[PDB]
Ligand binder design. Structure first.
Ligand SMILES: Cc1nnc(-c2nc(C)n3ccc(Nc4nccc(-c5cc(CN(C)C)n(C)n5)n4)cc23)o1
Length: 268
């Protein structure tokens, strides 16, 4: 859990920045090899510790692995490096990525979310900006800062007091402050829309309240250019208003798995 600061080398240039503080590239002296790492630096401590406590429990290829934690000048969260960075920024910069490759990447996210659902953990921040690329064909889910381990007796997490990424939030999140794997299914639909729109922001030019008003009228975002009908139908199904009728990640993953192999064998 706790790492040796003497074994950690941080780069001067920062990878990203936000509410948290900063993300910097580094190197950690492992068992015999040296491991390139992404380091979240705080510069709040309870939120970093809880985030590390969640990541310490997760074991899946489609989730970012935590190496450990370190207390130096600031509190640090050391993670395995996903070199190509956020999915949204990647697709904005690489607008010629094929449709089959986008299906492949969103399917990876669904396999990691299928795992999270089975482990009864709610992500609560599932967006294309929180998907990181190891390769152009290898996605991992990151950002477990809002993530919760569900109580043994509850299928949801109830938030006590409402910043919230409302454009990604299911109606029950807005209306009842209730966060479940099925609300993560809603966010995954928005994620699918972003990926097929090549990292474009959802509900362009709209306020949070205007989004709520639009969803309340039964209106949904349209089909992105070049997005197959089958993929847009899945997005719409993730956008089922009623939580009970909305599919779970095992059904979402199966839909995507089958479609991907249908496209794969069709290309041959
Ligand atoms: C903003 C922003 N945040 N990250 C970037 C960013 N930009 C480029 C070009 N990157 C390249 C590699 C990379 N690797 C990488 N690996 C493992 C973990 C992480 C990572 C990043 C975050 C922060 N979240 C807000 C995403 N956490 C919690 N974990 N990051 C990140 C990155 O931009």
């Amino acid at each position: 859990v706790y790492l040796d600061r003497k074994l950690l080398t941080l780069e001067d240039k920062e990878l990203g920045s936000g509410n948290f503080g900063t993300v910097k590239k580094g190197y950690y002296q492992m068992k015999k090899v040296v491991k390139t790492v992404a380091v979240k630096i705080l510069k709040l401590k309870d939120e970093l510790l809880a985030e590390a406590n969640v990541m310490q429990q997760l074991d899946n290829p489609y989730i970012v692995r935590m190496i450990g934690i370190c207390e130096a000048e600031s509190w640090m969260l050391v993670m395995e490096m996903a070199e190509l960075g956020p999915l949204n920024k990647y697709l904005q910069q690489n607008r010629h990525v094929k449709d089959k490759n986008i299906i492949e990447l969103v399917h990876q996210v669904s396999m990691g979310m299928k795992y999270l659902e089975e482990s009864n953990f709610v992500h609560r921040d599932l967006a294309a900006r929180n998907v990181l690329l190891v390769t152009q064909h290898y996605a991992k889910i990151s950002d477990f800062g809002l993530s919760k381990a569900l109580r043994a007796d509850e299928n949801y997490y109830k938030a006590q007091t409402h910043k919230w990424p409302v454009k990604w939030y299911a109606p029950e999140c807005i209306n009842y402050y209730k966060f479940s794997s099925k609300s993560d299914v809603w966010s995954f639909g928005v994620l699918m829309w972003e990926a097929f729109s090549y990292g474009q922001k959802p509900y362009r030019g709209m306020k949070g309240s205007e989004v709520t008003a639009m969803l309340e009228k039964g209106e949904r975002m349209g089909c992105p250019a070049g997005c197959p009908r089958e993929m847009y139908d899945l997005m719409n199904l993730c956008w089922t208003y009623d939580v009970e009728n909305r599919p779970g990640f095992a059904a979402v993953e199966l839909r995507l798995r089958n479609y991907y192999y249908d496209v794969v064998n069709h290309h041959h």
